[PDB]
Design a protein around this ligand. Sequence first.
Ligand code: PRO
Length: 56
Amino acid sequence: KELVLALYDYQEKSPREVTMKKGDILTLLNSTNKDWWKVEVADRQGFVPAAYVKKL
Ligand code: PRO
């Protein structure tokens, strides 16, 4: 339920990824992996690179 800030645009590159735009406020769903975090972007869910978001 915590929020993260998208630090960069990111276009999804595989089925389980999701696209985000810089400045988007995402809901953090799963941060157990060091490299890929599962997030909700508007009403879509998927993985983005952990380095490209910042916990709020
Ligand atoms: O699904 C895959 O294989 C790639 C690598 C991790 C996230 N997307």
